[PDB]
Recover the amino acids of this structure.
RNA sequence: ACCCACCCGACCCGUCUUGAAACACGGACCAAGGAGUCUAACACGUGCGCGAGUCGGGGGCUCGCACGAAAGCCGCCGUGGCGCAAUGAAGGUGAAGGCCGGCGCGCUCGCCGGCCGAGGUGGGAUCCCGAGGCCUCUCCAGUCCGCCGAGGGCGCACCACCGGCCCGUCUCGCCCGCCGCGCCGGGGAGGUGGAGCACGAGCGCACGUGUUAGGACCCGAAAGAUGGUGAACUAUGCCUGGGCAGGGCGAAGCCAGAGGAAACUCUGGUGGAGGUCCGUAGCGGUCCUGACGUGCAAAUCGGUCGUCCGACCUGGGUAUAGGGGCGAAAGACUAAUCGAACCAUCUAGUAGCUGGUUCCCUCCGAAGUUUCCCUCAGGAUAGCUGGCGCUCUCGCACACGCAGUUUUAUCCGGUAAAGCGAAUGAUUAGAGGUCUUGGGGCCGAAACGAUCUCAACCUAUUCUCAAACUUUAAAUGGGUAAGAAGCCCGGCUCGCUGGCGUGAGCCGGGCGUGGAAUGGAGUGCCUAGUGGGCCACUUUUGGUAAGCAGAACUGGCGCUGCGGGAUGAACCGAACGCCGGGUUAAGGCGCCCGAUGCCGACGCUCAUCAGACCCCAGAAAAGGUGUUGGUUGAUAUAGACAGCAGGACGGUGGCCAUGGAAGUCGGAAUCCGCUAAGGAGUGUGUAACAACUCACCUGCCGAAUCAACUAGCCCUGAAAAUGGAUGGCGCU
RNA sequence: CCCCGGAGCCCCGCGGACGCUACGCCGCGACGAGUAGGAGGGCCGCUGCGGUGAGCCUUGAAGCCUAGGGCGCGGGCCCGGGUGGAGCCGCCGCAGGUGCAGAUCUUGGUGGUAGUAGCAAAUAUUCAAACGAGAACUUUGAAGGCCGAAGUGGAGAAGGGUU
RNA sequence: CCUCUGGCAUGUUGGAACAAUGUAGGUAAGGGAAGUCGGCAAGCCGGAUCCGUAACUUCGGGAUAAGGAUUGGCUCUAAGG
RNA sequence: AAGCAUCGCGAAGGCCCGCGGCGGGUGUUGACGCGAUGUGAUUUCUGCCCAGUGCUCUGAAUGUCAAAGUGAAGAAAUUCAAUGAAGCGCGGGUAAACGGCGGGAGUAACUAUGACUCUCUUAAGGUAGCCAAAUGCCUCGUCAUCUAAUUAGUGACGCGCAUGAAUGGAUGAACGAGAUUCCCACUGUCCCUACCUACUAUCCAGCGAAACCACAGCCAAGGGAACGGGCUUGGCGGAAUCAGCGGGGAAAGAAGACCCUGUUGAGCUUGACUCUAGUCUGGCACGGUGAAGAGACAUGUUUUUUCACUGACCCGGUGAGGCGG
RNA sequence: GUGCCAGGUGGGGAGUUUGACUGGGGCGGUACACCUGUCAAACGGUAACGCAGGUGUCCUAAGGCGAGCUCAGGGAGGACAGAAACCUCCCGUGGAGCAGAAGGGCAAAAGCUCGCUUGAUCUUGAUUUUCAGUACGAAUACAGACCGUGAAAGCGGGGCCUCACGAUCCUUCUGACCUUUUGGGUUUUAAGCAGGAGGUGUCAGAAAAGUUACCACAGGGAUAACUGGCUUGUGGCGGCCAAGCGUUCAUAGCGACGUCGCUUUUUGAUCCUUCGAUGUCGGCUCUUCCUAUCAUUGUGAAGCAGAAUUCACCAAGCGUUGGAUUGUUCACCCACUAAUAGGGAACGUGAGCUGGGUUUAGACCGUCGUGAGACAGGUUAGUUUUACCCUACUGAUGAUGUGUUGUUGCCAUGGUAAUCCUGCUCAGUACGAGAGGAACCGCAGGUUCAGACAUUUGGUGUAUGUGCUUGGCUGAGGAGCCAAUGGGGCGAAGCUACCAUCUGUGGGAUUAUGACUGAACGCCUCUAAGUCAGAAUCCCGCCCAGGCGGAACGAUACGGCAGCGCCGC
């Protein structure tokens, strides 16, 4: 009593009932499996972003004032 | 709705199965009975109550309970359960951070005051603000009401990402603490394991589905175990009783007579031995393979047989009992039961295996493939199914994303083909080459001397090949990409990287349709059946082949009716709510049978076996002046072609072959003369000739003639057993 | 430039269905094969319980039968007539030992087979009479037969248990 | 096998026919195992008296070996107490 | 089965039962007996093989071998040591124990066989006998005989697939409901069938079952789960029945004995795995008295060896009848 | 001795086990865990007991660096030295080597030779490959240590890459001033935590021998042993071609090397059907079909003079026998014959038989097995059920119709029958050198088959006919009876036998074939239109049955109630 041994006959059909969906792409994928030495350093960089805040805020206010002067000169 | 008629349709259900009207099983008929239950445990969903709680048990207080064995209440209301905290094997430890100011050297470390208090990015239903319209019976003013709303905000839930905190663990480090300064205790930085925290969601009750444990959907073993009953049958022992015609053979002992010298021997009697013979009753049971075979009989009957004074037959009593007895041993017998009796129980024993499994409509609707399994008639796990949803989207003039497509870019490929004067391997032929050298020759003493030769090698060529070769190289095919998660500016962070710079991560602005066609998307939980398959196109391996076995690809059948294919799983057409009209497909249109009952068109073909439609149910090589087309060549007025009539020679017994071939078993040759012209000969035949026969030309007759291929129909090739099938009748 | 308790109405913002069991009612499109399997709805069906129908019932309940009348796609249902002779149903809830064609199913019943197979072992019966409703079979008589003293005869044992 | 003593009514029925198949009996011309797996089945033989008796042998048997003849009825004779 | 032949046992024994007993059977017995096996009267034989597996005999000369006991170190649990029973090993016997019993080459003044020789080999290498046997594949062996004809029968032959000596060989009168072959007789066995009898079957009166049963019942062909009663296409089809018949209903009978599957069994086997009654050995206990001596350690202890003793314990006898002084 | 422990022995006894896949199973293999090339249809992925192979290791270097070299092969040289020793020059895309299979990869290397070495070390996660996208193994990229090597850049955490390996439990070793060893403390011990090792090859991992013919149970047509299907290799039969054979001559008869077919009376494949059973070989008996024709009829051919013959055509009407051995099929032999052709029907035919053989159980022998047991090795003994149903067939009553009845008839359709031989004659003739040796027409008979019949012969005989005879019984005689038909002679009638006797017929159409006239094709041709002869064939005749088919004719209900036939209206 020998069987059928293997096949792939009805399988494509079976797969395509429910699509063959592409793998759901997000923005902001994880940093799992990224070269450790990198990840330390981007972690440290992220740690000290709040250091150098007061400088950054002022720079944007100076930029915003320069934009407001430019738009007044245009109008 | 009862009966009858007629036309068309129409095989018997159930079931296992790839496939059932089956020569697969179950089913004579009717009634009643008859199979997914209950308990427990889990999980998810749903409904209700309360909610950081919830809870009810168990107990108690209220009644003789009619209704109550209820109902109510309880600092027991919470002992306690579950929940509200984890993590570590454990000793144990145990979920906060930020900011600001100050003091220690701001040392991305240690200590003291103030403020905020569960971080941030992107997307987010929804709210909020809202420039601005858009009018009002006039020109302006102008509060009220809307409608829309560009633009901008707070952003639930949820998702993705990055930070953070707790426990385990590692690595590196530097400080704090005190009743006990210690092999004491506490912290930091950076990874990494945790069923964690990051303003809670549980508890109880109820219903549903699923999964289990239980007799566990219902029915079914062969077995296993405990405790009992039987020797009235039969097996063997023992006790006490009963039973066995008539004949044959004639053992020991005995007598007489005769012989013998003795030993003893003969002859005639008598005698009546024996697991002796015949043969009755008895006991048995050979053959007829007789009778019977739903019997007279759950083993009988008839004849024929074996034995019939002995290991004989036989009554009653008595002994031996179940892994035990008893056995002249056949695994025989042990109450119609024996390769382990019977009875009751354990027991509703177990069953991956048969069988069955009860009303209607509606909607969705499979699989026979995965990996694992003492797995291959079963499970597990993926897959395919359903159910419950949720989150968003906008036809409410104002859309994003997704696809069994295609387009434009761009990579991938080594199959078909092709190639072998390219590699690898195979392989033919001759040219050329003392390449090498040989082995065999012939002419050489021998000599790359001359001449051949065959070996391998080589120089150009040449024949033919490859699933496990290839320089080339398709078609079909597989990725990506075709924008807001995108571009373009400005600035900050780094313990990484570094002459300066990289690269990454952060903030803050600035810019909108970015190929065709179509379509509303996303997302989570429970989840059944299935895990025997088969069939066709094309591709394809094994095999002589198979209605054989095995893959790929799509589509079928299985699950599925309907028109066609006469008939039919699977072919072709087409996929079904119940009906009227119309129109089609694939198929048809002599009659069966709806439609050609057309003045249908043009050919082909006659068969003493005609032929007549995918799958398909049947023929080949090879033949045929049968007939019809082609193709190529001829021929012929220098009047042919056939049809009849006249000659077929000589050089020449040509040469090889003698065994005879002067043309003639065969073969190398193979030309001249006469010529009008005859082959050194097509055959007949001869031992060998001879003789005969087979061009070139005329005479007659009077226009086409003839050859070789080729392909259409038809025919030969063509033989099977019940009588027979283009479906039938038939048809020219 | 006036008020609908009155414009008279194709729109009426003063009040609003014949319609509105909002688990209702209505409108537009599309679609409809189905085993195994899943889910939904059943004013389908059975039996019992709490409610409820001032239900039904000897002026006839249940069941049974019906070439009667109907409804529903269907599960089924309702009426008429007959039969019967004592109980029974509708609705809202709850509960289940809840729906059969099959199981070589269980128990009971009934057919076809069929007036069929069959009533054939062991030689044998006949005549007259009696009784009697009735005689192939009883009894009596007569004849013809068999068992043929290892008996189909005459007596026990065991077993039966009144034969 | 037939009879007396004693006992029965032909074994759970009767009648009418006399087909095929059977079951149980018989018989067959000529041949005689040609039949058939095989003389299965049936047939031959059979009592008694008188003769006659092989191979072989465990000397006992074989042995009713085989093979032959006779057998009735009647009327007498002889022999046995 | 008689006959033959092995084997165990002198009774605190052999063999065996039993759950247990100062239990029981053999046994009311004693080797001319009890118990266990083979072979199978007589006659005549009974070859070789002790390598294998069995069984058995011996046993400080001795490898291993348990618990207890002895010593050792350790705080102790302990470990280590020496000691050392049967059993295995080690060494003898045993085949009327299971069983076993060869293969190459060459060789004789015609050829052929091979007396003879040469090897290689085992525990021996099949002896006497016997044979195509109930044992021989090839096989219907070859020769003879028996028949007209013989895969049969008999007699011979023997590199015998794969004979063979109490796994008994060869024989053999008598006997056999045993297996064959031939001959004589006899026959319906047959050529070749026929006629007769009785009881049936038949028809009737009375009486009266059963199995079986989806529906049913005329064929050919087709297709079809590849042999249809039903379907397609053809042939066709006429009530109700009687006696027969065995073609068909793939007729009935019985959930296939075969075969295969099942993680279903049972009977039996053993070199399966895991145990176990029984048995053999060692230890401790009931277990005492005396003598003697002997080693080992130590400078008393332990081991005890042998020889007595009787009081436990046992056995036998008896109507416990005379015992010791 | 008993009690209790210890070790041995212990199929006497118990319990249990005795894989899987598999063109049924068993035997054999391993396709059971891995790897290469192919299969594979140019992404990947893919099957079979597909193909060709490899694996259970090997390495202290064959691992890691760095340096330097260049390999196979060939040419040309050089004392001994030759095809091969050593040296030297040239060419050399790798044709070598790189542990092993193969594939890839590799030249100032991944090869060889040196120098120094232990990156084959310690430790987190991520990823790939198998994948369920779990494990194992194997690998990839990092990251942190500590090293190696190199001037350095770098490379290196095993082997250039693709295979070489193993869970839970248990053990063992290594590791930390580690945790626990529970009323506390110290110490041994044990228990944890983390990493290696001891193995499961049936490789995601039970601990495991047979036998059963004394057997059982659940099932299976998922699967064998028949038929039947498909196929036809194999067997059987038949073409085509034509090198040869046939003295000569390819083809009278043959036919190599090649080739194309049919057949399912061979055997295989295969497994579709049947395992809630389709009775498993042979023989007997009986019917029917096929033809691939042995004989018989009619014919063509010859290497046919005659006789004998083989080759072919129409053709299956009619035949195809008796025995010996064997269970046989098959085989062989004897005999006859005209001939002793071949098959089919579920390998026709078991409710038809038989049962000899296969194939239960009883037994023997050989070989095999320790044994239970085994043996397409031999032997012997071994239960063959049921029909009354339906159909089919056989015969038997009937049926509807015709007004009823009877008569004598016709005939639709079915069936169907004759066969072959000898002798005589032709005739010792044709023919032939002879040897030998036919035929047509006649005539006489016989075989097998069919249909009858009984005068005769035979058989039967229960006329229970008539004798005769046994045993018994009616007292005897006479007359009888009984003994399942007492026995036996003879035997009427009647059945009945190649065991007696009789009878068995004629046409038509044509087939194969051979011919006519005669074109096609100025001739010739059997043919194309036309015509002839023609047969065991076929159809009818005769012969049998006689239709839900008819025919002519007869009589048609006196009656006691009757009832009808015509005619006309
Ligand atoms: Mg499968
Ligand atoms: Mg099944
Ligand atoms: Mg099947
Ligand atoms: Mg069905
Ligand atoms: Mg069928
Ligand atoms: Mg079944
Ligand atoms: Mg049935
Ligand atoms: Mg019911
Ligand atoms: Mg819930
Ligand atoms: Mg679940
Ligand atoms: Mg359950
Ligand atoms: Mg049960
Ligand atoms: Mg058991
Ligand atoms: Mg019998
Ligand atoms: Mg009968
Ligand atoms: Mg009777
Ligand atoms: Mg048993
Ligand atoms: Mg049950
Ligand atoms: Mg299973
Ligand atoms: Mg759905
Ligand atoms: Mg490829
Ligand atoms: Mg190619
Ligand atoms: Mg299955
Ligand atoms: Mg298959
Ligand atoms: Mg199915
Ligand atoms: Mg539907
Ligand atoms: Mg369903
Ligand atoms: Mg009453
Ligand atoms: Mg109830
Ligand atoms: Mg019912
Ligand atoms: Mg009757
Ligand atoms: Mg009496
Ligand atoms: Mg009688
Ligand atoms: Mg009577
Ligand atoms: Mg009686
Ligand atoms: Mg006779
Ligand atoms: Mg014969
Ligand atoms: Mg014979
Ligand atoms: Mg006899
Ligand atoms: Mg004799
Ligand atoms: Mg012996
Ligand atoms: Mg020995
Ligand atoms: Mg043996
Ligand atoms: Mg010998
Ligand atoms: Mg004979
Ligand atoms: Mg002999
Ligand atoms: Mg022997
Ligand atoms: Mg001996
Ligand atoms: Mg022997
Ligand atoms: Mg049928
Ligand atoms: Mg029949
Ligand atoms: Mg049957
Ligand atoms: Mg079965
Ligand atoms: Mg069974
Ligand atoms: Mg299994
Ligand atoms: Mg068992
Ligand atoms: Mg063992
Ligand atoms: Mg056992
Ligand atoms: Mg298997
Ligand atoms: Mg591809
Ligand atoms: Mg280098
Ligand atoms: Mg290397
Ligand atoms: Mg590193
Ligand atoms: Mg303490
Ligand atoms: Mg046996
Ligand atoms: Mg067997
Ligand atoms: Mg036996
Ligand atoms: Mg099958
Ligand atoms: Mg020639
Ligand atoms: Mg077959
Ligand atoms: Mg049958
Ligand atoms: Mg023919
Ligand atoms: Mg047959
Ligand atoms: Mg039959
Ligand atoms: Mg039979
Ligand atoms: Mg037999
Ligand atoms: Mg037997
Ligand atoms: Mg009858
Ligand atoms: Mg007288
Ligand atoms: Mg009598
Ligand atoms: Mg003609
Ligand atoms: Mg004519
Ligand atoms: Mg004629
Ligand atoms: Mg006729």
């Amino acid at each position: 009593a020998k069987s059928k041994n293997h096949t792939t006959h009805n399988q494509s059909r079976k797969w395509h009932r429910n699509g063959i969906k592409k793998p759901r792409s997000q923005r902001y994928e994880s940093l799992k499996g990224v070269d450790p030495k990198f990840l330390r350093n981007m972690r440290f960089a992220k740690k000290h972003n709040k250091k150098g805040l007061k400088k950054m805020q002022a720079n944007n206010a100076k930029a915003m004032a320069a934009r407001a002067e430019a738009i007044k000169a245009l109008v």
User: Anything to note?
Assistant: Residues 54-74 of chain A form the longest helix (21 residues). The two ends of chain A are 92 Å apart (CA to CA). Chain A is about 55% helix and 0% strand.
